[PDB]
Scaffold this active site. Structure first.
Site, short mmCIF file in Angstrom:
data_model
loop_
_atom_site.label_atom_id
_atom_site.label_comp_id
_atom_site.label_asym_id
_atom_site.label_seq_id
_atom_site.Cartn_x
_atom_site.Cartn_y
_atom_site.Cartn_z
N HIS H 62 0.73 -1.38 -0.19
CA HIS H 62 -0.04 -0.05 -0.05
C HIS H 62 0.96 1.13 -0.12
N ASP H 92 9.10 20.44 -27.33
CA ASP H 92 9.29 19.23 -26.20
C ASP H 92 10.47 19.09 -25.37
N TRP H 127 7.83 0.20 4.77
CA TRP H 127 8.48 1.09 3.42
C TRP H 127 10.10 1.32 3.66
N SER H 157 14.31 5.87 -12.69
CA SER H 157 13.27 6.61 -13.41
C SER H 157 13.27 7.95 -13.07
N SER H 158 13.06 8.36 -11.86
CA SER H 158 13.10 9.70 -11.19
C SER H 158 14.52 10.52 -11.56
N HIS H 241 13.69 12.47 4.80
CA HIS H 241 12.97 14.04 4.87
C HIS H 241 12.88 14.86 3.75
N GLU H 243 12.60 14.01 1.02
CA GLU H 243 11.53 13.33 0.04
C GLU H 243 10.02 14.13 0.58
N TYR H 245 9.26 16.56 0.83
CA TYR H 245 8.99 17.80 0.28
C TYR H 245 9.07 17.84 -1.33
N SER H 256 -1.26 27.30 -5.94
CA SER H 256 -0.90 28.96 -6.09
C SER H 256 -1.44 29.38 -7.66
N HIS H 290 15.36 14.46 12.88
CA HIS H 290 14.38 14.44 13.70
C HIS H 290 13.36 13.13 13.49
N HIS H 291 13.59 12.38 12.47
CA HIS H 291 13.00 10.99 12.31
C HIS H 291 13.81 9.99 13.23
N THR H 316 7.07 28.50 5.29
CA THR H 316 5.58 27.88 4.99
C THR H 316 4.89 28.74 5.50
N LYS H 319 3.74 31.21 3.08
CA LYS H 319 3.16 30.81 2.01
C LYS H 319 1.67 30.56 2.24
N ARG H 438 2.20 2.05 16.01
CA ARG H 438 2.05 1.59 14.68
C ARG H 438 2.13 0.13 14.29
C1 HEA Z 1 3.90 15.84 2.14
C2 HEA Z 1 4.39 15.11 3.37
C3 HEA Z 1 4.92 16.16 4.60
C4 HEA Z 1 5.02 17.48 4.63
C5 HEA Z 1 4.76 18.65 3.76
C6 HEA Z 1 5.57 17.30 6.20
C7 HEA Z 1 5.91 18.75 6.73
C8 HEA Z 1 6.44 18.88 8.22
N1 HEA Z 1 6.78 17.83 9.01
FE1 HEA Z 1 6.48 15.72 8.63
N2 HEA Z 1 6.32 13.65 8.12
C9 HEA Z 1 5.62 13.11 7.01
C10 HEA Z 1 5.47 13.93 5.70
C11 HEA Z 1 5.31 15.30 5.65
N3 HEA Z 1 5.91 16.20 6.54
C12 HEA Z 1 5.73 11.50 6.86
C13 HEA Z 1 5.44 10.69 5.84
C14 HEA Z 1 6.14 11.33 8.19
C15 HEA Z 1 6.49 9.72 8.65
C16 HEA Z 1 7.43 9.09 7.86
C17 HEA Z 1 7.65 7.88 8.90
O1 HEA Z 1 7.94 7.89 9.83
O2 HEA Z 1 7.02 6.60 8.35
C18 HEA Z 1 6.60 12.54 8.76
C19 HEA Z 1 6.99 12.63 10.22
C20 HEA Z 1 7.52 13.79 10.75
C21 HEA Z 1 8.45 13.85 11.94
C22 HEA Z 1 9.18 12.76 12.57
C23 HEA Z 1 7.96 12.12 13.64
C24 HEA Z 1 8.35 10.86 14.23
O3 HEA Z 1 8.70 9.95 13.36
O4 HEA Z 1 8.54 10.83 15.27
C25 HEA Z 1 8.45 15.18 12.19
C26 HEA Z 1 9.25 15.75 13.30
O5 HEA Z 1 9.46 16.98 13.56
C27 HEA Z 1 7.76 16.12 11.33
C28 HEA Z 1 7.78 17.28 11.31
C29 HEA Z 1 7.26 18.23 10.19
C30 HEA Z 1 7.28 19.70 10.27
C31 HEA Z 1 7.86 20.49 11.29
C32 HEA Z 1 6.92 20.11 8.64
C33 HEA Z 1 6.72 21.47 8.15
O6 HEA Z 1 6.80 21.56 6.93
C34 HEA Z 1 5.27 21.87 8.50
C35 HEA Z 1 5.14 23.44 8.60
C36 HEA Z 1 3.72 23.70 8.91
C37 HEA Z 1 3.31 24.77 9.55
C38 HEA Z 1 4.19 25.75 10.27
C39 HEA Z 1 1.73 25.06 9.53
C40 HEA Z 1 1.41 26.25 8.32
C41 HEA Z 1 1.89 27.56 8.79
C42 HEA Z 1 1.30 28.31 9.50
C43 HEA Z 1 -0.33 28.26 9.68
C44 HEA Z 1 1.80 29.94 9.74
C45 HEA Z 1 1.98 29.88 11.25
C46 HEA Z 1 2.86 29.18 11.77
C47 HEA Z 1 3.56 29.34 12.89
C48 HEA Z 1 3.26 30.53 13.74
C49 HEA Z 1 4.46 28.22 13.68
N4 HEA Z 1 6.94 15.24 10.47
C1 HEA Z 2 0.23 9.22 -1.01
C2 HEA Z 2 0.38 8.22 0.07
C3 HEA Z 2 -1.02 7.67 0.87
C4 HEA Z 2 -2.29 7.65 0.51
C5 HEA Z 2 -3.06 8.24 -0.62
C6 HEA Z 2 -2.56 6.85 1.55
C7 HEA Z 2 -4.14 6.54 1.61
C8 HEA Z 2 -4.86 5.81 2.73
N1 HEA Z 2 -4.21 5.19 3.67
FE1 HEA Z 2 -2.15 5.03 4.14
N2 HEA Z 2 -0.19 5.13 4.58
C9 HEA Z 2 1.05 5.51 3.69
C10 HEA Z 2 0.59 6.50 2.51
C11 HEA Z 2 -0.76 6.76 2.00
N3 HEA Z 2 -1.81 6.66 2.30
C12 HEA Z 2 2.34 5.55 4.10
C13 HEA Z 2 3.62 6.04 3.52
C14 HEA Z 2 2.28 4.52 5.27
C15 HEA Z 2 3.00 4.12 6.33
C16 HEA Z 2 3.14 2.51 5.87
C17 HEA Z 2 4.10 1.92 6.82
O1 HEA Z 2 4.03 2.04 8.27
O2 HEA Z 2 5.26 1.07 6.37
C18 HEA Z 2 0.58 4.44 5.33
C19 HEA Z 2 0.19 3.64 6.37
C20 HEA Z 2 -1.63 3.53 6.32
C21 HEA Z 2 -2.07 2.91 7.84
C22 HEA Z 2 -1.30 2.54 9.00
C23 HEA Z 2 -0.69 1.06 8.89
C24 HEA Z 2 0.02 0.70 9.96
O3 HEA Z 2 0.85 1.72 10.58
O4 HEA Z 2 0.02 -0.53 10.61
C25 HEA Z 2 -3.36 2.93 7.56
C26 HEA Z 2 -4.65 2.68 8.57
O5 HEA Z 2 -5.60 2.83 8.19
C27 HEA Z 2 -3.73 3.46 6.01
C28 HEA Z 2 -5.00 3.82 5.61
C29 HEA Z 2 -5.29 4.78 4.50
C30 HEA Z 2 -6.58 4.70 3.72
C31 HEA Z 2 -8.09 4.12 4.32
C32 HEA Z 2 -6.57 5.44 2.60
C33 HEA Z 2 -7.37 6.15 1.66
O6 HEA Z 2 -8.26 5.39 1.80
C34 HEA Z 2 -7.66 7.76 1.99
C35 HEA Z 2 -8.45 8.36 1.02
C36 HEA Z 2 -7.61 8.30 -0.41
C37 HEA Z 2 -8.01 7.94 -1.67
C38 HEA Z 2 -9.01 7.19 -1.57
C39 HEA Z 2 -6.86 8.06 -2.78
C40 HEA Z 2 -7.76 8.78 -3.86
C41 HEA Z 2 -6.86 9.05 -4.98
C42 HEA Z 2 -6.65 8.37 -5.84
C43 HEA Z 2 -7.15 6.97 -5.62
C44 HEA Z 2 -5.74 8.60 -6.90
C45 HEA Z 2 -6.65 9.01 -8.19
C46 HEA Z 2 -6.89 10.42 -8.07
C47 HEA Z 2 -6.44 11.33 -8.90
C48 HEA Z 2 -5.45 11.11 -9.98
C49 HEA Z 2 -6.80 12.83 -8.75
N4 HEA Z 2 -2.30 3.74 5.39
CU LIG Z 3 11.14 14.75 7.40
#
Ligand code: HEA
Ligand code: HEA
Ligand SMILES: [Cu+2]
Ligand SMILES: CCCCCCCCCCCCCCCC(=O)OC[C@H](COP(=O)([O-])OCC[N+](C)(C)C)OC(=O)CCCCCCCCCCCCCCC
Ligand SMILES: CCCCCCCCCCCCCCCCCCCC(=O)O[C@H](COC(=O)CCCCCCCCCCCCCC)COP(=O)(O)OCCN
Ligand SMILES: CCCCCCCCCCCCCCCCCCCC(=O)O[C@H](COC(=O)CCCCCCCCCCCCCC)COP(=O)(O)OCCN
Ligand SMILES: CCCCCCCCCCCCCCCCCCCC(=O)O[C@H](COC(=O)CCCCCCCCCCCCCC)COP(=O)(O)OCCN
Ligand SMILES: CCCCCCCCCCCCCCCCCCCC(=O)O[C@H](COC(=O)CCCCCCCCCCCCCC)COP(=O)(O)OCCN
Ligand SMILES: CCCCCCCCCCCCCCCC(=O)OC[C@H](COP(=O)(O)OCCN)OC(=O)CCCCCCCCCCCCCCC
Ligand code: CUA
Ligand SMILES: [Ca+2]
Ligand SMILES: [Mg+2]
Lengths: 49, 36, 236, 74, 55, 269, 98, 534, 50
Positions: H62, H92, H127, H157-158, H241, H243, H245, H256, H290-291, H316, H319, H438
């Protein structure tokens, strides 16, 4: 004729002012309504200890 | 400006408090209706 | 302690470091709600007011004074929020004067606890494994996936030191109520120190993914008074 | 009546693998190399019997015996 | 050298670029024979591996 | 130029390539290599005759891809000035990725070197390993590689100057001076006391230099196709992109060797 | 400044040679944050008569009614513009009932 | 024909192929989520008999199918390949022949992944394929070997796609398009490509180290031999991390562009927007550990990583506010893309606040490896990146395909997915704060409350996906009839207040990009004579 | 919402039996163990969700 200007400016100011004020009560109710309630019931059991 | 802004601002804060209470407070309904 | 059905908050604290974890979360949550209350309010007002606004003021792009503020507006709340974070971080590692150390080594799919201290009159380490209780032998009244057959005992009002490792794969020692979490890597020895202040039983779990027995790895821990710990270690 | 190993400078952090290892090396160099006094050697002996997993000791006991101990006890 | 007379051949050929050179038939025909064996033989061992029989 | 004539030509300087079968043939050759290698590692085939076949088809298909590129640049002539800048820029972005692969290998070396593991000795290199002596034989490779950068430089400028006997001689010495590096490196590998299986020390040692070793064999092949194209009047005096990217490749690959000579040989003993 | 604003759209409207330009300038005049002065609006009415478009003259006050933001200030613009509007013949939306 | 699709060189056909592969993998990966929710609905093994395997394998499948086979080929390979040449003005891409191999190595990875799942062992490692559990002693089959080979194919590919985009943007622009004057989507793609270029090789090195250690006997991470299983964490997360982004920066360009077309006013402070977009990419390379808070790092490095990760909120936030300032004054058109953008602005800010809450190393000892983090990253992934993908589809599809899509039947899908995803992912934060870990198939009984609620909500989102599939069918079939009757909306910008209906019909599109001026569908050879700007 | 909830119940019928610990008499007996150990001073240990 009164030169109506800056309608947006103050409307912008009040919008930002209300957002902090409305967010102020949300923040303040968490601290002094919920979180402060948790501390007191926490201290009572330790007080009897 | 007090007269004009009052007719539009204050009703919205009441509507404001309703929608945000729905998006955030919905799980309170499930627990009360039948935590059972 | 145990988790509660339909519960939405921290388990009751039993250590001073968990209170700081609890206290820090609220101070950040005190400020998370203002921003949440600001962005959401401006969202509702703009949507409702200017969806009904025909004329668009298409020449407002620069905004010299506003941009300066909300560029530095977050930079100050980040400052206030970052003070209690740093004191908490550097007082969690106070291992200046502990009193007794416990090792927690996990074989894959279970835990082995051994007390390296030699306070006991035997002069030998006390080691015993802790397996989950299967559903076939789940005695009437026990907690499912949470109760084991052998537990670990820690005195109250004592500065305890934990040293964890692993043998087969990574598995992490974790007890939510006490606020301790260490990775437990198969070749390293990481340590923490927590102080417990009230008798009771705490249950925790194994966090890091470690195979097919990941779910069947509880960590039962209970605190007894200083005497009763002594009439337990001698008999073990 | 409870006590344990005190805070140690040079090993002030969470990672403690070297703190265990050095006590084992120090203990054997305390005895085989100028073991003129029994008392000071026991400081390490109560320090690696603590803080160190049991099965590591038997592994290091076989490797020492066979002559494949990484540490220099002599 | 031969580049000038090779330029006149590659241009104005109305054939795929890998078939234009008169010596291309020597490489292409043996290639597709070996290529087919390369991308079909590993696909035959897939069901054998799913069952678990080791050759 | 008449308005009618200009319309009988491209209006942009970019090159439009005809549909080709090699992007997918290489794709299918990469699956056979990935699928056959995963089987022979655990049995399921019996001998390593399918792995060799997959590598041969993977290499042969790649040759036929490069065979098309030289045809559309030398006979059809589709590489205008704008196209030539993109190829150079694309190669510069490709060598940066190559460097960062090595950057991940230096990180693996410094992790186990600065604080050597306890299952090893308390020292580095581990107890009982006879490391390669930096002054006896690797120093010969260092002087050889530096001299390669000096003889490919005047081979490049002689080609610009206009005389082909010095340009052709510079590459011939350059090729044989790189082959000597490969054969001398082959001698040291078969005479070393430690193997890839000798704990962590052999893993990082043979992954850094081994990746460089595999890159030197691909450098000699690149040098070999520039000698064929120069001898048969392909490379001109003002248009040689297949040769400029070779000179950048050999100069960058000397800097990487100097870094591998300081930390893996000098600093690691 | 406001006086500079008024004196520069007083010149823009005097140079509008088609019905696309008149509807382009008036979309610029009412796109600014300030409500335009009554001197500005009078010149806009003259432009619509010059390009012979009745419905854009009607939309001038409709634009003003939403723009002026005051129920008495709309009457203030109404009074000073009675002479020019009645002379031209522009009907208000409420009077027209469309 | 075979030549048109098997020998593709046209970038638009490759974009269509990328799109087509994304939906199939999207449906395949969202059924495993359905099975996971059905297994977690109630305590006890309900549907999968007792197999803890085939649960972790399903989770791995998944995650990989959702990340590496839906978002990557749709946002980068689908939208980036189709729209970047058109907005820049290039006919192109720079390397048209490696653009095809950037795609055709993806189906091979699917074969490697499926045959990995079908071998008797399977890959139950997550994963994040950590060495000691995915070593040869714990996973003894050829399964994770085949899983690794898929990662290499996706990485190549990427990488080859990323090299193509950097050269294309740098020297294939039109006669007036200075690097200073670019659309924001192109800027997002450019910065994303640069992050990919510098991040992929380290992942490749670590993954190949894992492969060699399993089969070639190298003590790379083997404890017996001096190896360190924590070096793998550094090597993997250095790509990890940055990634998180690559999957959101192209999601920023879409938002935007959306919020300044249905709100008829240009973006507030564009140069600050590109500065903030570049700063997030640059500074995300300084926060990777931080991970790895609880792995046993030093106290002083934890303070550094805590201080450096909070700086992420400064650009952030810029934006977030600049998006709320370009809609303040303009006229708002509430269409489906605008409804997706407005939902994104709220849900991504809800995710980011939880993220900054997670950024403190002293607090993360209570929120790590729980469903709290799952709820966090499901807001920025399933509500931050998926929503902008839906918004982009509803934004560009009638222009690309030439077929309208029955507006009122799409707003129903929007509301269904909104109130379905909010039900799945909001209760998770309640499960995480009580300490629910988890990656478990079955949980203590006291956690049965919110899990049932979350399981009910998955069916709503699945029904919305089925409705979306029907919308696709009704768009491709009799979609030319949708713009004849009154089922859909034709113009994305209504006329201004003083703009008559007969003058709007000579200037229909007032856009700031070349995309909406082209014929529908765009021609095979779009640009013969180059376009001129300024 | 009606179709999703209705279809949710249908598939739930084709599932396994419940755990033997959800009897409301197991859950009532779980509390005596917790109450004797003083599980939660602030907050509860009800463990009842039948
Ligand atoms: C698109 C995906 C995406 C994005 C954009 C982000 C964005 C951020 N993420 Fe993360 N993150 C994940 C995907 C993402 N993340 C995934 C997949 C994991 C788990 C992976 C795994 O362990 O399996 C993860 C896990 C993860 C961890 C590790 C947690 C753990 O494993 O214990 C941390 C630690 O700090 C973190 C922090 C942040 C922060 C600070 C931002 C910042 O970019 C967010 C900033 C946002 C704001 C600040 C709010 C908007 C701003 C405002 C409203 C302005 C006002 C704000 C202030 C006054 C502060 N996220
Ligand atoms: C893009 C990334 C992505 C997306 C879309 C999702 C979507 C969903 N995921 Fe998650 N999930 C992960 C990334 C994602 N997930 C990752 C990285 C983990 C960690 C795995 C690990 O622990 O190893 C995880 C783990 C995870 C867990 C925890 C498993 C565990 O820790 O044991 C659960 C639990 O319910 C869950 C449920 C769901 C459900 C119900 C949806 C969906 O039902 C939510 C609704 C969204 C959709 C129905 C998709 C709609 C869009 C499309 C189908 C594409 C077509 C559309 C266009 C082209 C516009 N997934
Ligand atoms: Cu990160
Ligand atoms: C918001 C949109 C809807 C969000 C999803 C709501 C899901 C409600 C739900 O799951 O409620 C189920 C409970 C069942 O009752 P229970 O107390 O949980 O006992 C267990 C019974 N099982 C679960 C074995 C059948 O019964 C209830 O508690 C029903 C409460 C329903 C409250 C109204 C809907 C939510 C607020 C709107
Ligand atoms: C940005 C922030 C994003 C969200 C972060 C996560 C939320 C953090 C906690 C805040 C909510 C705290 C609500 C107060 C609370 O716990 O009260 C309970 C709410 O229970 C409920 O179930 C009511 C839920 C309504 C909210 C009372 O009930 P209880 O939990 O004591 O009931 C146990 C029966 N066994
Ligand atoms: C902080 C949190 C911000 C949240 C999002 C806010 C979005 C709304 C932005 C409103 C526009 C801001 C702006 O540039 O307007 C200025 C006035 O702002 C103001 O009046 C605001 C000043 C700051 C209030 C505190 C005009 O400025 P101007 O009047 O100089 O324009 C003279 C032009 N020729
Ligand atoms: C795996 C990694 C593969 C790396 C490949 C790197 C390719 C670099 C060169 C890219 C094209 C350069 C180019 O257009 O040069 C053409 C010749 O190059 C060529 O055709 C060079 C082909 C020889 C490269 C051999 C590398 C080893 C491959 C091993 C298997 C993979 C002719 O351009 P020109 O301007 O010189 O023509 C002057 C005519 N008047
Ligand atoms: C890793 C593979 C090598 C990547 C680095 C070379 C890429 C930059 C040079 C370049 O654009 O030429 C490519 C040829 O090399 C290649 O990509 C051919 C070697 C392929 C190796 C496959 C394994 C694609 O050139 P193009 O043929 O796409 O466009 C030709 C337009 N005149
Ligand atoms: C949210 C709470 C849950 C709501 C559940 C709704 C179920 C479906 C009802 C459909 C009714 C319908 O169709 O609504 C139609 C209405 C009125 O449209 P109209 O004025 O053109 O009149 C139509 C007849 N001529 O338009 C809208 O919806 C548009 C407004 C949407 C606003 C944003 C929505 C996305 C969420 C953003 C995040 C929250 C912002 C605020 C935060 C506090
Ligand atoms: Cu042990 Cu997880
Ligand atoms: Ca179940
Ligand atoms: Mg972990």
């Amino acid at each position: 004729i009164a030169p109506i200007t800056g309608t947006i400016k103050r409307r912008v100011i009040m919008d930002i002012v209300l957002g902090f004020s409305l967010g102020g009560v949300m923040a303040s109710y968490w601290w002094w309504g919920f979180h402060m309630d948790k501390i007191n019931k926490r201290e009572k059991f330790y007080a009897e200890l | 400006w007090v007269i004009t802004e009052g007719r539009r601002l204050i009703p919205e804060i009441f509507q404001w408090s309703a929608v945000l209470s729905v998006c955030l407070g919905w799980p309170g309904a499930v627990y009360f209706f039948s935590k059972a | 302690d145990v988790p509660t059905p339909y519960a939405c908050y921290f388990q009751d604290s039993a250590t001073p470091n968990q209170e700081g974890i609890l206290e820090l979360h609220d101070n950040i949550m005190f400020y998370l709600l203002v921003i949440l209350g600001l962005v959401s309010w401006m969202l509702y007002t703009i949507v409702m007011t200017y969806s009904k606004n025909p004329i668009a003021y298409k020449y407002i792009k620069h905004g010299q004074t506003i941009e300066v503020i909300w560029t530095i507006f977050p930079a100050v709340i980040l400052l206030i929020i970052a003070f209690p974070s740093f004191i908490l971080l550097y007082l969690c590692d106070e291992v200046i004067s502990p009193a007794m150390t416990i090792k927690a080594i996990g074989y894959q799919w279970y835990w082995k606890y051994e007390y390296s201290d030699f306070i006991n009159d035997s002069g030998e380490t006390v080691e015993f494994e802790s397996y989950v209780i299967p559903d076939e032998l789940l005695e009437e009244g026990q907690l499912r996936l949470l109760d084991t057959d052998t537990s670990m005992v820690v005195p109250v009002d004592t500065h305890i030191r934990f040293v964890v490792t692993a043998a087969d794969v990574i598995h992490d020692f974790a007890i939510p109520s006490l606020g301790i979490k260490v990775d437990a890597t198969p070749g390293r020895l990481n340590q923490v120190s927590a102080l417990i202040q009230r008798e009771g039983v705490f249950y925790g779990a194994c966090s890091e993914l470690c195979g097919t027995g990941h779910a069947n790895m509880p960590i039962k821990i209970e605190a007894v008074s200083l005497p009763k710990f002594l009439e337990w270690l001698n008999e073990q | 009546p409870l006590h344990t190993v005190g805070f140690d400078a040079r090993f002030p952090q969470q990672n403690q693998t070297k703190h265990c290892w050095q006590s084992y090396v120090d203990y054997h160099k305390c005895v085989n190399m100028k073991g003129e006094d029994f008392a000071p050697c026991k400081v390490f002996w109560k320090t690696y019997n603590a803080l160190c997993p049991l099965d590591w000791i038997e592994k290091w006991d076989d490797q020492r015996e066979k002559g494949i101990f990484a540490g220099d006890i002599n | 050298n031969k580049v000038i007379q090779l330029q006149k051949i590659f241009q104005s050929s109305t054939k795929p670029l890998w078939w234009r050179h008169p010596r291309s038939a020597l490489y292409l025909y043996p290639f597709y024979a070996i290529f087919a064996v390369a991308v079909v033989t590993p696909l035959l061992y897939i069901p054998n591996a799913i069952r678990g029989i080791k050759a | 130029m008449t308005h009618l004539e200009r319309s009988r030509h491209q209006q942009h300087p970019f090159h439009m390539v005809m549909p080709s079968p090699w992007p997918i043939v290489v794709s299918f050759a990469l699956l056979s290599l990935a699928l056959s290698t995963a089987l022979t590692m655990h049995g399921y085939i019996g001998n390593m005759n399918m792995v060799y076949l997959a590598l041969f088809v993977l290499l042969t298909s790649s040759i036929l891809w490069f065979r098309d590129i030289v045809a559309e640049a030398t006979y059809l002539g589709d590489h205008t000035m704008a196209v030539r800048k993109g190829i150079n820029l694309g190669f510069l972005m490709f060598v940066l990725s190559e460097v960062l692969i090595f950057a991940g290998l230096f990180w693996a070396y410094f992790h186990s070197a600065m604080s050597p593991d306890v299952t090893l000795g308390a020292c580095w290199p581990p107890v009982g390993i006879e490391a390669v002596q930096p002054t006896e034989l690797p120093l010969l490779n260092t002087i050889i590689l530096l001299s390669s950068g000096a003889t490919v430089t005047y081979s490049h400028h002689a080609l610009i100057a206009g005389n082909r006997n010095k340009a052709l001689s510079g590459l011939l010495i350059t090729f044989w001076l790189i082959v000597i590096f490969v054969t001398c490196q082959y001698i040291e590998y078969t005479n070393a006391a430690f193997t890839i299986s000798d704990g962590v020390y052999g893993s990082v040692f043979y992954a850094g230099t081994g990746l460089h070793f595999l890159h030197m064999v691909m450098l000699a092949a690149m040098l070999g196709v520039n000698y064929w194209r120069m001898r048969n009047y392909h490379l001109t005096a003002g248009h040689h992109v297949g040769y400029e990217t070779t000179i950048i490749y050999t100069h960058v690959l000397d800097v990487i060797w100097l870094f591998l000579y300081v930390v893996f040989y000098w600093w690691g003993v | 400044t406001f006086e500079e604003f008024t004196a520069r759209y007083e010149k823009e409207f005097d140079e509008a040679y088609d019905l696309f330009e008149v509807q382009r300038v008036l979309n610029n005049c009412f796109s600014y944050d300030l409500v335009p002065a009554p001197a500005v609006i009078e010149k806009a009415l003259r432009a619509a008569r010059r390009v012979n478009d009745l419905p854009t003259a009607i939309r001038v006050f409709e634009a003003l009614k939403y723009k002026v933001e005051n129920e008495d200030q709309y009457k203030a613009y109404l009074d000073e513009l009675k002479d020019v509007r009645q002379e031209l013949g522009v009907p208000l939306k409420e009077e027209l009932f469309p | 024909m075979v030549q048109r699709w098997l020998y593709s060189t046209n970038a638009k056909d490759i974009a269509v192929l990328y799109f087509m592969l994304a939906i199939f993998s999207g449906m395949a990966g969202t059924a495993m989520s359905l099975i996971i929710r059905l297994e977690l609905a109630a305590p006890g093994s309900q549907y999968l008999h007792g197999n803890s395997q085939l649960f972790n394998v399903l989770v791995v499948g998944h995650a990989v199918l959702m990340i590496f086979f839906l978002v990557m080929p749709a946002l980068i390979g689908g939208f980036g390949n189709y729209l970047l040449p058109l907005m820049i003005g290039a006919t192109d891409t720079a390397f048209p022949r490696i653009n095809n191999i950037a795609f055709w190595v993806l189906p091979m990875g699917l074969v490697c992944l499926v045959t990995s799942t079908l071998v008797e062992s399977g890959a139950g490692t997550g994963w994040t394929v950590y060495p000691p559990l995915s070593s040869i002693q714990a996973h003894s089959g050829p399964s994770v070997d085949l899983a690794i080979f898929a990662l290499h194919l996706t990485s190549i590919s990427s990488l080859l796609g990323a090299i193509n985009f950097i050269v294309t943007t740098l020297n294939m622009r039109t006669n007036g398009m200075t690097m200073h004057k670019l659309p924001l989507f192109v800027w997002s793609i450019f910065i994303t490509a640069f992050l990919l270029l510098l991040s992929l090789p380290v992942l490749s090195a670590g993954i190949t180290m894992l492969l060699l250690d399993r089969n070639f006997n190298t003590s790379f991470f083997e404890v017996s031999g001096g190896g360190d299983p924590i070096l793998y964490e550094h090597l993997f997360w250095f790509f990890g991390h940055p990634e998180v982004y690559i999957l959101i920066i192209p999601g920023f360009g879409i938002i935007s562009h959306v919020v300044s077309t249905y709100s008829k006013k240009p973006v507030f402070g564009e140069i600050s927007m590109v500065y903030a977009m570049a700063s997030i990419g640059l500074l995300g390379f300084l926060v990777w550990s931080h991970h790895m808070y609880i792995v046993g790092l030093d106290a002083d490095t934890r303070a550094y990583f805590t201080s450096a990760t909070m700086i992420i909120a400064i650009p952030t936030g810029i934006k977030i506010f600049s998006w709320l300032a370009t809609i303040h004054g303009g006229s708002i058109r509430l269409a489906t893309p605008m409804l997706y953008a407005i939902a994104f602005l709220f849900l991504f800010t809800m995710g980011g606040l939880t993220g900054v809450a997670l950024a403190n190393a002293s607090l993360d000892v209570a929120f790590h490896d729980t469903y709290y983090v799952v709820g966090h990253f499901h807001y920025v992934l399933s509500m931050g990146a998926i929503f902008s993908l839906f918004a982009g589809y509803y934004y560009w599809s009638p222009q690309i395909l030439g077929l309208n899509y029955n507006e009122k039947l799409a707003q129903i899908q929007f509301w269904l997915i909104f109130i379905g995803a909010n039900v799945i992912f909001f209760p998770m934060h309640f499960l995480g704060i009580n300490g629910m870990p988890r990656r478990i198939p079955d949980y203590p009984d006291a956690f049965a409350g919110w899990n049932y609620v979350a399981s009910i909500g998955s069916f709503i989102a699945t029904l919305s996906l089925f409705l979306f599939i029907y919308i696709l069918y009704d768009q491709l079939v009799n979609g030319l009839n949708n713009k004849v009757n009154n089922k859909s909306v034709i113009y994305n910008k209504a006329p201004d207040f003083v703009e008559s209906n007969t003058i709007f019909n000579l200037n229909t599109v007032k856009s700031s990009s070349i995309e909406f001026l082209l014929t529908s569908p765009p021609a095979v050879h779009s640009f013969n004579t180059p376009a001129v700007q300024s | 919402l009606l179709f999703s909830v209705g279809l949710f119940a249908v598939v739930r019928m084709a599932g396994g039996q419940d755990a033997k610990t959800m009897n409301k008499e197991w859950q009532l007996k779980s509390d005596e163990y917790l109450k004797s150990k003083n599980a939660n001073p602030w907050g509860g240990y009800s463990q009842v969700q039948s």
